[PDB]
């Protein structure tokens, strides 16, 4: 059956304060002798969680500032630097003040991915002006994934399959009953599952059909690969009052050197992690195949790069060096930050992540991949 699962948990986007207090010691009842037929690819819990995450993202953005005024022609020069590195543009514009009959000449550092050139060669505009309306994310609500336990109502139950080697579907012996799922962090990302739950026995390959290319191959790691980010720019913020009781937090001067952001992955671990992955893939594809790993074929920035949210800033890491081997000391992946983010593949609901002050760092754990085979 399918029901409305509610949340349970121990200033956040996913409204975790509103959740029911979870049981300090969850009660798990190992059911004996019972075999149940699972199917992870027709799970209604997944679609319901997708709807819940989208709804929470929408409700967190409801009371925040609307940056409709910010869509104007911007006189952009390069940030003061010697050096490509056009990655930051010092853009000046006439913003509306608290008084409707006055205007102020203000400036802001905008990433190059957030501004497109119009026409006069110095005139720019935000990327979203010709497709969407932009809503500044509130500076006080955090994007940090807090674990969420999905509990079913009374009269329903959740069946956890404890079988370590779970292909994903079909009959699973050693079933158990739980009142809530484990803490599932809502971590949005592409090309790599971060801060996830790990397999216990082996690396696990799970695809709806391993013959259909359109179906992604979810890889789960038995051991995590630690990934360390830094946004080395200091990036102070600055409030510009765009209207009565409405502020716009814009990047000001950078305190230090203009350095490319990145995330590092250990080479000796990521190799032999791909070793386990190629062993488990050769299980499905025969022993004589040559399991090559190439980088992203193309598409949007959200799927050509390992996209994610780190320290409140939205990173897009190249990961061309990760997915490099034939398979018969760190790997610095350069990442680009964006502030105009269109989550959930939508249009009309873009948002402006305010600039974070200081220096951001990730310490995440790659616990899987989302691969795609070439036909």
């Amino acid at each position, epitope marked *: 059956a399918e029901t409305t699962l509610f949340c349970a948990s121990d200033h956040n986007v996913w409204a975790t304060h509103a959740c029911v207090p979870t049981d300090p010691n969850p009660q798990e009842i190992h059911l004996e002798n019972v075999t149940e037929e699972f199917n992870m690819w027709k799970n209604n819990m997944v679609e319901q969680m997708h709807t819940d995450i989208i709804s929470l993202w929408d409700q967190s953005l409801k009371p925040c500032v609307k940056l409709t005024p910010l869509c104007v022609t911007l006189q952009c020069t390069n940030v003061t630097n010697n050096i490509m590195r056009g990655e930051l543009k010092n853009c000046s514009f006439n913003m509306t003040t608290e008084l409707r009959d006055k205007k102020q000449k203000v400036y802001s550092l905008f990433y190059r991915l957030d501004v497109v050139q119009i026409n006069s060669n110095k005139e720019y505009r935000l990327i979203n002006c010709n*497709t969407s309306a932009i809503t500044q994310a509130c500076p006080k609500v955090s994007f940090e994934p807090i674990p969420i336990h999905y509990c079913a109502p009374a009269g329903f139950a959740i069946l956890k399959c404890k079988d370590k080697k779970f292909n994903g579907t079909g009959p699973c012996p050693s079933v158990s009953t739980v009142q809530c799922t484990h803490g599932i962090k809502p971590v949005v990302s592409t090309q790599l599952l971060l801060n996830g739950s790990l397999a216990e026995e082996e690396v696990m390959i799970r695809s*709806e*059909n391993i013959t*259909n*290319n*359109a*179906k992604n191959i979810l890889v789960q790691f038995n051991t995590p690969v630690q990934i360390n980010c830094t946004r080395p720019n200091n990036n102070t913020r600055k409030s510009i009052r765009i209207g009565p009781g409405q502020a716009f937090y814009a990047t000001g001067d950078i305190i230090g050197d203009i350095r490319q952001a990145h995330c590092n992955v250990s080479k000796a671990t990521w190799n032999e992690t791909l070793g386990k992955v190629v062993k488990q893939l050769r299980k499905h594809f025969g022993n004589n195949t040559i399991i090559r790993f*190439a980088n*992203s*074929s*193309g*598409g*949007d920035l*959200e*799927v050509t790069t390992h996209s994610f949210n780190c320290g409140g800033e939205f990173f897009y890491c190249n990961t061309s060096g990760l997915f490099n081997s034939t398979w018969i000391d760190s790997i610095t992946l350069p990442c680009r930050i964006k502030q105009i983010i269109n989550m959930w*593949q939508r*249009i*009309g609901q873009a948002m402006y992540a305010p600039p974070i002050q200081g220096v951001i760092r990730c310490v995440s754990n790659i616990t899987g991949l989302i691969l*795609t085979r*070439d*036909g």
Partner: nanobody
Amino acid sequence: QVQLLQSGAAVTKPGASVRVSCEASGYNIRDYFIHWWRQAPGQGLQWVGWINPKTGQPNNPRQFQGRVSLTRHASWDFDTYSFYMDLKALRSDDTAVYFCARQRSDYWDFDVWGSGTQVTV
């Protein structure tokens, strides 16, 4: 109704590039991958590759790696969806009719195809 209006036949030379457009309309373009196929003169069909309309992620076989480029472009509110197929290192071998079809389930049922575009090199 569901319609995949293709572009007119184009002529190029060995080395030049060709673009084939597949303006799609009449349905939710997002939930259905768009596949490109190639009918050589007097031969069977050949799989050029699919493009995801949501993310834009392309997928081509080993023959067309670094050679073909599947792209898309959605107008306002995604109502229209122009799918482009680009070729770069064009040869006389690649004289064929390029069809664009809509995969409509996991079975790879292409219930709708395009009119066709005769690329002659």
